[PDB]
mmCIF file of C-alpha atoms in Angstrom:
data_model
loop_
_atom_site.group_PDB
_atom_site.id
_atom_site.type_symbol
_atom_site.label_atom_id
_atom_site.label_comp_id
_atom_site.label_asym_id
_atom_site.label_seq_id
_atom_site.Cartn_x
_atom_site.Cartn_y
_atom_site.Cartn_z
ATOM 1 C CA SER A 1 15.691 -14.308 9.663
ATOM 2 C CA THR A 2 13.314 -11.436 10.327
ATOM 3 C CA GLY A 3 13.062 -7.716 9.641
ATOM 4 C CA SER A 4 11.142 -4.893 11.322
ATOM 5 C CA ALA A 5 10.856 -1.318 10.018
ATOM 6 C CA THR A 6 8.810 1.682 11.023
ATOM 7 C CA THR A 7 6.525 3.179 8.404
ATOM 8 C CA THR A 8 5.624 6.887 8.667
ATOM 9 C CA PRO A 9 2.792 8.901 7.092
ATOM 10 C CA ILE A 10 4.048 11.379 4.498
ATOM 11 C CA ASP A 11 1.635 14.114 5.569
ATOM 12 C CA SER A 12 -1.103 15.032 8.046
ATOM 13 C CA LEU A 13 -3.752 13.120 6.066
ATOM 14 C CA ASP A 14 -1.953 9.762 5.868
ATOM 15 C CA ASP A 15 -1.944 10.056 2.069
ATOM 16 C CA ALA A 16 0.802 7.416 1.932
ATOM 17 C CA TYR A 17 3.423 5.853 4.192
ATOM 18 C CA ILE A 18 7.200 5.726 3.725
ATOM 19 C CA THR A 19 9.605 3.147 5.067
ATOM 20 C CA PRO A 20 13.397 3.489 5.028
ATOM 21 C CA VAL A 21 15.206 0.970 2.815
ATOM 22 C CA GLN A 22 18.963 0.424 2.572
ATOM 23 C CA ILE A 23 20.227 -0.131 -0.996
ATOM 24 C CA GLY A 24 23.775 -0.884 -2.043
ATOM 25 C CA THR A 25 27.211 -0.831 -0.467
ATOM 26 C CA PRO A 26 27.812 1.422 1.374
ATOM 27 C CA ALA A 27 24.115 1.711 2.121
ATOM 28 C CA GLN A 28 22.065 4.394 0.409
ATOM 29 C CA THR A 29 18.885 4.876 2.432
ATOM 30 C CA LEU A 30 15.780 5.762 0.428
ATOM 31 C CA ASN A 31 12.244 6.198 1.763
ATOM 32 C CA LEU A 32 9.992 3.878 -0.213
ATOM 33 C CA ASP A 33 6.237 3.433 -0.439
ATOM 34 C CA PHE A 34 5.564 -0.228 0.379
ATOM 35 C CA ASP A 35 2.808 -1.262 -2.007
ATOM 36 C CA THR A 36 0.971 -4.584 -1.656
ATOM 37 C CA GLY A 37 -0.846 -3.729 -4.905
ATOM 38 C CA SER A 38 2.217 -3.845 -7.176
ATOM 39 C CA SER A 39 5.370 -5.865 -7.662
ATOM 40 C CA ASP A 40 8.213 -3.571 -8.761
ATOM 41 C CA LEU A 41 10.888 -2.115 -6.493
ATOM 42 C CA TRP A 42 11.771 1.116 -8.293
ATOM 43 C CA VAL A 43 13.684 4.180 -7.206
ATOM 44 C CA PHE A 44 14.533 7.710 -8.161
ATOM 45 C CA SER A 45 18.135 7.538 -9.301
ATOM 46 C CA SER A 46 21.120 9.285 -10.828
ATOM 47 C CA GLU A 47 19.563 8.183 -14.154
ATOM 48 C CA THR A 48 16.245 9.978 -13.580
ATOM 49 C CA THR A 49 15.636 12.867 -15.989
ATOM 50 C CA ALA A 50 16.860 15.858 -13.996
ATOM 51 C CA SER A 51 13.764 18.009 -14.505
ATOM 52 C CA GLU A 52 11.674 15.181 -13.031
ATOM 53 C CA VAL A 53 13.566 15.128 -9.729
ATOM 54 C CA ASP A 54 12.356 17.631 -7.115
ATOM 55 C CA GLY A 55 13.685 16.919 -3.626
ATOM 56 C CA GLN A 56 13.742 13.109 -3.660
ATOM 57 C CA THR A 57 16.728 11.134 -2.460
ATOM 58 C CA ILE A 58 18.292 9.255 -5.362
ATOM 59 C CA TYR A 59 20.014 5.904 -5.714
ATOM 60 C CA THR A 60 23.363 6.184 -7.510
ATOM 61 C CA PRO A 61 24.378 2.687 -8.621
ATOM 62 C CA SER A 62 27.887 3.792 -9.644
ATOM 63 C CA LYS A 63 28.580 4.518 -5.952
ATOM 64 C CA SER A 64 27.527 1.014 -4.878
ATOM 65 C CA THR A 65 30.222 -1.646 -5.016
ATOM 66 C CA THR A 66 27.580 -4.386 -5.111
ATOM 67 C CA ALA A 67 25.454 -2.882 -7.922
ATOM 68 C CA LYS A 68 25.417 -4.713 -11.245
ATOM 69 C CA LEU A 69 23.544 -3.655 -14.378
ATOM 70 C CA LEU A 70 21.014 -6.310 -15.325
ATOM 71 C CA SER A 71 21.932 -6.299 -18.977
ATOM 72 C CA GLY A 72 19.113 -5.624 -21.423
ATOM 73 C CA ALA A 73 16.420 -5.338 -18.762
ATOM 74 C CA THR A 74 13.887 -2.521 -18.800
ATOM 75 C CA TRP A 75 10.708 -1.802 -16.888
ATOM 76 C CA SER A 76 7.627 0.353 -17.290
ATOM 77 C CA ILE A 77 4.635 0.592 -14.982
ATOM 78 C CA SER A 78 1.331 2.422 -14.852
ATOM 79 C CA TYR A 79 -0.637 2.655 -11.625
ATOM 80 C CA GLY A 80 -4.371 2.821 -10.997
ATOM 81 C CA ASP A 81 -4.189 6.535 -10.242
ATOM 82 C CA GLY A 82 -2.766 7.262 -13.691
ATOM 83 C CA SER A 83 0.834 7.762 -12.588
ATOM 84 C CA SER A 84 3.743 5.948 -14.228
ATOM 85 C CA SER A 85 7.491 5.411 -14.335
ATOM 86 C CA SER A 86 10.060 3.483 -16.373
ATOM 87 C CA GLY A 87 13.764 2.762 -16.681
ATOM 88 C CA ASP A 88 16.472 0.116 -16.512
ATOM 89 C CA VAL A 89 17.493 -2.389 -13.847
ATOM 90 C CA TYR A 90 20.334 -3.151 -11.469
ATOM 91 C CA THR A 91 20.736 -5.939 -8.987
ATOM 92 C CA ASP A 92 22.023 -4.887 -5.565
ATOM 93 C CA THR A 93 21.818 -5.619 -1.863
ATOM 94 C CA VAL A 94 18.601 -4.383 -0.268
ATOM 95 C CA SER A 95 17.833 -4.378 3.445
ATOM 96 C CA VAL A 96 14.600 -3.563 5.263
ATOM 97 C CA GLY A 97 14.584 -3.317 9.019
ATOM 98 C CA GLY A 98 17.609 -5.595 9.357
ATOM 99 C CA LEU A 99 16.488 -8.184 6.764
ATOM 100 C CA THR A 100 18.899 -8.392 3.824
ATOM 101 C CA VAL A 101 18.364 -9.686 0.285
ATOM 102 C CA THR A 102 21.321 -9.944 -2.059
ATOM 103 C CA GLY A 103 20.748 -9.774 -5.807
ATOM 104 C CA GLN A 104 17.466 -7.864 -5.528
ATOM 105 C CA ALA A 105 16.257 -6.224 -8.728
ATOM 106 C CA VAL A 106 16.373 -2.468 -8.160
ATOM 107 C CA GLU A 107 14.545 -0.735 -10.972
ATOM 108 C CA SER A 108 16.179 2.599 -11.695
ATOM 109 C CA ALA A 109 13.816 5.274 -13.042
ATOM 110 C CA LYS A 110 14.812 7.149 -16.154
ATOM 111 C CA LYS A 111 11.358 8.757 -16.326
ATOM 112 C CA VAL A 112 8.644 9.393 -13.753
ATOM 113 C CA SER A 113 5.245 11.062 -14.154
ATOM 114 C CA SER A 114 4.421 14.423 -12.644
ATOM 115 C CA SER A 115 2.649 12.964 -9.593
ATOM 116 C CA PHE A 116 5.926 11.358 -8.493
ATOM 117 C CA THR A 117 8.067 14.421 -9.184
ATOM 118 C CA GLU A 118 5.661 16.570 -7.195
ATOM 119 C CA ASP A 119 5.876 14.362 -4.112
ATOM 120 C CA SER A 120 9.266 15.042 -2.578
ATOM 121 C CA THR A 121 8.699 12.581 0.273
ATOM 122 C CA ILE A 122 8.539 9.351 -1.780
ATOM 123 C CA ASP A 123 11.836 8.109 -3.229
ATOM 124 C CA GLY A 124 10.286 5.085 -4.962
ATOM 125 C CA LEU A 125 8.057 2.067 -4.433
ATOM 126 C CA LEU A 126 8.668 -1.383 -2.975
ATOM 127 C CA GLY A 127 6.112 -3.787 -4.399
ATOM 128 C CA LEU A 128 4.718 -6.559 -2.235
ATOM 129 C CA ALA A 129 2.061 -8.094 -4.503
ATOM 130 C CA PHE A 130 2.814 -11.341 -6.349
ATOM 131 C CA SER A 131 5.860 -11.471 -8.617
ATOM 132 C CA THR A 132 3.687 -12.375 -11.604
ATOM 133 C CA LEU A 133 2.878 -8.621 -11.842
ATOM 134 C CA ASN A 134 6.522 -7.514 -12.015
ATOM 135 C CA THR A 135 7.081 -5.460 -15.187
ATOM 136 C CA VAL A 136 10.762 -6.166 -15.905
ATOM 137 C CA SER A 137 11.350 -7.344 -19.467
ATOM 138 C CA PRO A 138 12.537 -9.638 -20.956
ATOM 139 C CA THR A 139 13.160 -11.498 -17.695
ATOM 140 C CA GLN A 140 10.557 -10.885 -14.984
ATOM 141 C CA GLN A 141 12.025 -10.256 -11.534
ATOM 142 C CA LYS A 142 10.998 -11.243 -8.014
ATOM 143 C CA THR A 143 9.785 -8.968 -5.248
ATOM 144 C CA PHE A 144 11.796 -8.330 -2.112
ATOM 145 C CA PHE A 145 9.413 -10.583 -0.169
ATOM 146 C CA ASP A 146 9.629 -13.386 -2.738
ATOM 147 C CA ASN A 147 13.442 -13.244 -2.589
ATOM 148 C CA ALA A 148 13.485 -13.149 1.231
ATOM 149 C CA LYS A 149 10.808 -15.772 1.819
ATOM 150 C CA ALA A 150 12.881 -18.929 2.055
ATOM 151 C CA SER A 151 15.185 -17.332 4.641
ATOM 152 C CA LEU A 152 12.411 -15.949 6.839
ATOM 153 C CA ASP A 153 11.475 -17.683 10.076
ATOM 154 C CA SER A 154 7.910 -17.833 8.704
ATOM 155 C CA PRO A 155 6.909 -16.888 5.124
ATOM 156 C CA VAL A 156 4.863 -13.841 6.126
ATOM 157 C CA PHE A 157 4.933 -10.100 6.385
ATOM 158 C CA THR A 158 2.604 -7.877 8.392
ATOM 159 C CA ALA A 159 1.295 -4.353 7.923
ATOM 160 C CA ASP A 160 0.419 -2.313 10.993
ATOM 161 C CA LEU A 161 -0.319 1.151 9.642
ATOM 162 C CA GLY A 162 -1.002 4.027 12.035
ATOM 163 C CA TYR A 163 -3.756 6.604 11.992
ATOM 164 C CA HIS A 164 -1.940 9.953 11.969
ATOM 165 C CA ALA A 165 1.016 8.114 13.522
ATOM 166 C CA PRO A 166 3.877 5.781 12.572
ATOM 167 C CA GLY A 167 3.361 2.040 12.285
ATOM 168 C CA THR A 168 5.332 -1.051 11.401
ATOM 169 C CA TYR A 169 6.112 -3.507 8.623
ATOM 170 C CA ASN A 170 7.460 -6.823 9.931
ATOM 171 C CA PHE A 171 8.930 -9.641 7.856
ATOM 172 C CA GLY A 172 9.140 -13.244 8.986
ATOM 173 C CA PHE A 173 7.186 -13.134 12.253
ATOM 174 C CA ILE A 174 3.872 -12.164 13.793
ATOM 175 C CA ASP A 175 4.182 -9.742 16.726
ATOM 176 C CA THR A 176 1.538 -11.085 19.085
ATOM 177 C CA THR A 177 1.713 -7.899 21.172
ATOM 178 C CA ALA A 178 0.628 -5.720 18.227
ATOM 179 C CA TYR A 179 -3.060 -6.643 18.076
ATOM 180 C CA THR A 180 -6.015 -7.454 20.312
ATOM 181 C CA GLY A 181 -8.087 -10.628 20.248
ATOM 182 C CA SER A 182 -7.378 -13.159 17.521
ATOM 183 C CA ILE A 183 -6.319 -12.955 13.887
ATOM 184 C CA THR A 184 -8.995 -14.150 11.466
ATOM 185 C CA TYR A 185 -7.572 -15.672 8.319
ATOM 186 C CA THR A 186 -9.362 -15.626 4.989
ATOM 187 C CA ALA A 187 -8.691 -17.123 1.546
ATOM 188 C CA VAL A 188 -6.700 -15.325 -1.148
ATOM 189 C CA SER A 189 -6.892 -15.591 -4.909
ATOM 190 C CA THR A 190 -3.633 -14.851 -6.712
ATOM 191 C CA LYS A 191 -5.245 -15.061 -10.164
ATOM 192 C CA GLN A 192 -4.840 -11.323 -10.825
ATOM 193 C CA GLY A 193 -1.501 -11.070 -8.986
ATOM 194 C CA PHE A 194 -3.004 -9.285 -5.976
ATOM 195 C CA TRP A 195 -3.760 -10.122 -2.357
ATOM 196 C CA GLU A 196 -7.388 -10.575 -3.398
ATOM 197 C CA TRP A 197 -9.954 -11.739 -0.867
ATOM 198 C CA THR A 198 -13.687 -11.611 -0.153
ATOM 199 C CA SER A 199 -15.113 -9.574 2.701
ATOM 200 C CA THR A 200 -18.274 -10.994 4.242
ATOM 201 C CA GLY A 201 -20.127 -7.661 4.454
ATOM 202 C CA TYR A 202 -20.385 -4.290 6.115
ATOM 203 C CA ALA A 203 -22.138 -2.009 8.569
ATOM 204 C CA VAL A 204 -22.484 1.767 8.700
ATOM 205 C CA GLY A 205 -22.128 3.310 12.144
ATOM 206 C CA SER A 206 -24.239 1.474 14.703
ATOM 207 C CA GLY A 207 -26.408 0.011 11.946
ATOM 208 C CA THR A 208 -27.125 -3.641 11.303
ATOM 209 C CA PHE A 209 -24.496 -5.735 9.525
ATOM 210 C CA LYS A 210 -25.273 -6.525 5.886
ATOM 211 C CA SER A 211 -23.997 -9.954 4.884
ATOM 212 C CA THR A 212 -22.766 -9.714 1.320
ATOM 213 C CA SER A 213 -19.633 -10.870 -0.493
ATOM 214 C CA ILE A 214 -17.264 -8.071 -1.497
ATOM 215 C CA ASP A 215 -14.263 -9.200 -3.522
ATOM 216 C CA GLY A 216 -11.344 -6.796 -3.294
ATOM 217 C CA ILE A 217 -7.619 -6.344 -2.823
ATOM 218 C CA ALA A 218 -5.574 -5.509 0.265
ATOM 219 C CA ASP A 219 -3.534 -2.596 -1.084
ATOM 220 C CA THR A 220 -1.197 -0.602 1.146
ATOM 221 C CA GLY A 221 -0.291 1.620 -1.813
ATOM 222 C CA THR A 222 -3.815 3.006 -2.210
ATOM 223 C CA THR A 223 -4.905 5.732 0.224
ATOM 224 C CA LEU A 224 -8.666 5.258 0.300
ATOM 225 C CA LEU A 225 -11.295 2.523 0.595
ATOM 226 C CA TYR A 226 -12.982 1.868 -2.779
ATOM 227 C CA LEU A 227 -16.176 -0.189 -2.607
ATOM 228 C CA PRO A 228 -19.275 -0.855 -4.740
ATOM 229 C CA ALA A 229 -21.502 2.149 -5.384
ATOM 230 C CA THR A 230 -24.375 0.620 -3.400
ATOM 231 C CA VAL A 231 -22.197 0.288 -0.266
ATOM 232 C CA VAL A 232 -20.688 3.749 -0.636
ATOM 233 C CA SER A 233 -24.104 5.365 -1.138
ATOM 234 C CA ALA A 234 -25.388 3.655 2.011
ATOM 235 C CA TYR A 235 -22.437 5.062 3.979
ATOM 236 C CA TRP A 236 -22.669 8.669 2.789
ATOM 237 C CA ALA A 237 -26.464 8.724 3.174
ATOM 238 C CA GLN A 238 -25.766 8.758 6.924
ATOM 239 C CA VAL A 239 -23.825 12.055 6.661
ATOM 240 C CA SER A 240 -26.033 15.153 6.368
ATOM 241 C CA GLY A 241 -25.053 17.187 3.341
ATOM 242 C CA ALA A 242 -22.747 14.588 1.806
ATOM 243 C CA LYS A 243 -22.933 14.218 -1.966
ATOM 244 C CA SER A 244 -21.029 12.836 -4.910
ATOM 245 C CA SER A 245 -19.338 15.637 -6.809
ATOM 246 C CA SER A 246 -18.335 14.920 -10.389
ATOM 247 C CA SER A 247 -16.263 18.128 -10.414
ATOM 248 C CA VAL A 248 -14.268 17.167 -7.324
ATOM 249 C CA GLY A 249 -14.091 13.471 -8.257
ATOM 250 C CA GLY A 250 -16.019 11.705 -5.523
ATOM 251 C CA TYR A 251 -18.011 12.039 -2.357
ATOM 252 C CA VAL A 252 -17.562 15.208 -0.363
ATOM 253 C CA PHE A 253 -19.131 16.179 2.933
ATOM 254 C CA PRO A 254 -19.451 19.271 5.145
ATOM 255 C CA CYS A 255 -16.334 19.672 7.211
ATOM 256 C CA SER A 256 -18.633 20.358 10.210
ATOM 257 C CA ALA A 257 -19.964 16.772 10.079
ATOM 258 C CA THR A 258 -19.234 13.979 12.508
ATOM 259 C CA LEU A 259 -18.585 10.870 10.403
ATOM 260 C CA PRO A 260 -19.963 7.453 11.330
ATOM 261 C CA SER A 261 -17.716 4.431 11.549
ATOM 262 C CA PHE A 262 -17.630 1.772 8.863
ATOM 263 C CA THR A 263 -17.338 -1.933 9.661
ATOM 264 C CA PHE A 264 -16.152 -4.610 7.243
ATOM 265 C CA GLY A 265 -16.383 -8.368 7.691
ATOM 266 C CA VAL A 266 -13.518 -10.836 7.667
ATOM 267 C CA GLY A 267 -15.173 -14.208 7.951
ATOM 268 C CA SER A 268 -17.228 -14.002 11.149
ATOM 269 C CA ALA A 269 -14.953 -11.244 12.497
ATOM 270 C CA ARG A 270 -15.464 -7.498 12.163
ATOM 271 C CA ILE A 271 -12.997 -4.639 11.646
ATOM 272 C CA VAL A 272 -14.263 -1.198 12.649
ATOM 273 C CA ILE A 273 -12.927 1.861 10.863
ATOM 274 C CA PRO A 274 -13.551 4.906 13.094
ATOM 275 C CA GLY A 275 -15.297 7.826 11.449
ATOM 276 C CA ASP A 276 -12.286 10.090 11.815
ATOM 277 C CA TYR A 277 -10.264 7.742 9.557
ATOM 278 C CA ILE A 278 -12.689 8.593 6.743
ATOM 279 C CA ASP A 279 -11.983 12.359 6.848
ATOM 280 C CA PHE A 280 -9.487 13.517 4.189
ATOM 281 C CA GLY A 281 -9.935 17.195 4.922
ATOM 282 C CA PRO A 282 -10.773 20.238 2.831
ATOM 283 C CA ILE A 283 -10.937 19.693 -0.911
ATOM 284 C CA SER A 284 -8.794 22.841 -1.301
ATOM 285 C CA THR A 285 -7.158 25.043 1.298
ATOM 286 C CA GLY A 286 -9.760 26.939 3.311
ATOM 287 C CA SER A 287 -12.764 25.074 1.902
ATOM 288 C CA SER A 288 -15.544 23.854 4.162
ATOM 289 C CA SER A 289 -16.147 20.910 1.814
ATOM 290 C CA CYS A 290 -14.163 17.855 2.886
ATOM 291 C CA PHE A 291 -13.128 14.826 0.832
ATOM 292 C CA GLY A 292 -14.384 11.405 1.824
ATOM 293 C CA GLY A 293 -12.215 8.403 2.562
ATOM 294 C CA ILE A 294 -14.737 5.863 1.243
ATOM 295 C CA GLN A 295 -15.309 6.188 -2.498
ATOM 296 C CA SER A 296 -16.947 4.196 -5.266
ATOM 297 C CA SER A 297 -14.936 1.569 -7.125
ATOM 298 C CA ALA A 298 -17.318 1.758 -10.087
ATOM 299 C CA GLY A 299 -15.147 2.090 -13.163
ATOM 300 C CA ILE A 300 -11.945 1.074 -11.342
ATOM 301 C CA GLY A 301 -12.974 -2.485 -12.064
ATOM 302 C CA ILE A 302 -11.948 -3.763 -8.646
ATOM 303 C CA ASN A 303 -12.698 -3.030 -5.000
ATOM 304 C CA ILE A 304 -9.704 -1.793 -3.037
ATOM 305 C CA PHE A 305 -9.140 -2.124 0.704
ATOM 306 C CA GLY A 306 -6.625 0.685 0.860
ATOM 307 C CA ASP A 307 -4.997 2.416 3.809
ATOM 308 C CA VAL A 308 -8.292 3.714 5.246
ATOM 309 C CA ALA A 309 -9.329 0.105 5.862
ATOM 310 C CA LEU A 310 -5.962 -1.501 6.534
ATOM 311 C CA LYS A 311 -4.871 1.030 9.152
ATOM 312 C CA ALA A 312 -7.830 -0.074 11.306
ATOM 313 C CA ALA A 313 -6.295 -3.563 11.500
ATOM 314 C CA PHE A 314 -3.190 -5.611 12.052
ATOM 315 C CA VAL A 315 -2.844 -7.360 8.696
ATOM 316 C CA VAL A 316 -0.982 -10.588 7.975
ATOM 317 C CA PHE A 317 0.141 -11.282 4.418
ATOM 318 C CA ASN A 318 0.766 -15.026 4.581
ATOM 319 C CA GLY A 319 2.945 -16.143 1.682
ATOM 320 C CA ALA A 320 2.774 -19.858 2.406
ATOM 321 C CA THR A 321 2.340 -22.242 -0.529
ATOM 322 C CA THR A 322 -1.358 -21.396 -0.437
ATOM 323 C CA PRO A 323 -1.395 -17.704 0.506
ATOM 324 C CA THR A 324 -3.943 -16.277 2.943
ATOM 325 C CA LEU A 325 -4.676 -12.929 4.603
ATOM 326 C CA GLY A 326 -5.190 -12.356 8.294
ATOM 327 C CA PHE A 327 -6.920 -9.446 10.034
ATOM 328 C CA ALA A 328 -7.020 -8.545 13.717
ATOM 329 C CA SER A 329 -8.326 -5.535 15.573
ATOM 330 C CA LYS A 330 -5.730 -3.479 17.430
#
C-alpha cells in the first residue's frame, strides 16, 4: 500500500504545516502537524477542557463506531518549545492520503497548554519519530508509520515541504519526479528516539564550505534551523546589523537586509537553503527588526534541522531494519 497527502503551511511564515487526517467511522477529518521529532498521535477532542479549545476541530470518539477506549492508558507530553498536552487513549481507524491503519492509538487530549489553544489551525500532532519515544502509559503505543510499515510497498515516508506553498507527505514510495539529481543517504542513530544524523558541514552564502561534523535531528515539527553557536555566528556576521537579542530570544536582523543562503552537507552532497527561507519577518507587527530562521542550539542540547532546512530538500525517512535518511535537492 501507499499514501499521499498534501501538507499546507498554517500561515504566511511557514510556522508549521498541517496535513488532513481521517479518524474514525464515519471519518472525522482533523488537520494534524506531522512531527518527525515526536511519537504521539494526539488530538483535540470532545474530552478537551472547554476553555482550552478555541477554533480547533475536535475528535469525538463517541461518534465513531470503530473507536474503543484503551482501558487504563494515559499520556502526557512536553515539547522542546515548552508546550504540553495530556489525556487518555482510544484505538481507532486512521487514514492519511488513502493509507489506512486500523487499531491506531489516538491520544485524546484532556488538557493542552496555551500555545496549542491559541493556534486554531492545528488540531493535534501526528508523531513520526521512533515509537520508543511514545508517552502512553502503562503500555507504550506505536506510531502511525510503525503500524503501517509492514503493509507499505517500501518501509519509507518522504517529506517534501514547500516554501510559502503546499507540499507533500508520501508513505510507502519515493516519487522520483519530486526531486532533482540523486538522493544522498546518510546514517541514522535511533539511540535518542529521533531521526538523528550527522551533517558533513556548512557554507554561508558563496563562501567556502567548512567540513565539520554536525550531529542533529531531522524534525518536521520544529520551525527553525538550530545549530551550534559558532555556525550561527558565522552566518549572521554576513548580515549587516544582525545581532543576538536576549530580549527577543535570538538573532534579529534589519528587515531591509538581503539574507545570504546557507548550505549544509549530506555526505558529499550539498543542500542550499535560499536566503529568503531564513526570513521570519517582523518581531512584532510594524517593526523593522526581523527574526532570523537560523538560531543557536546552545542550551537546547541538540541541533535541530527543522523546517527551514528540510523545506529546501526532498527528504526520505527510510524505516528499513537499519534506518537511514535521504536528502535530494528539488
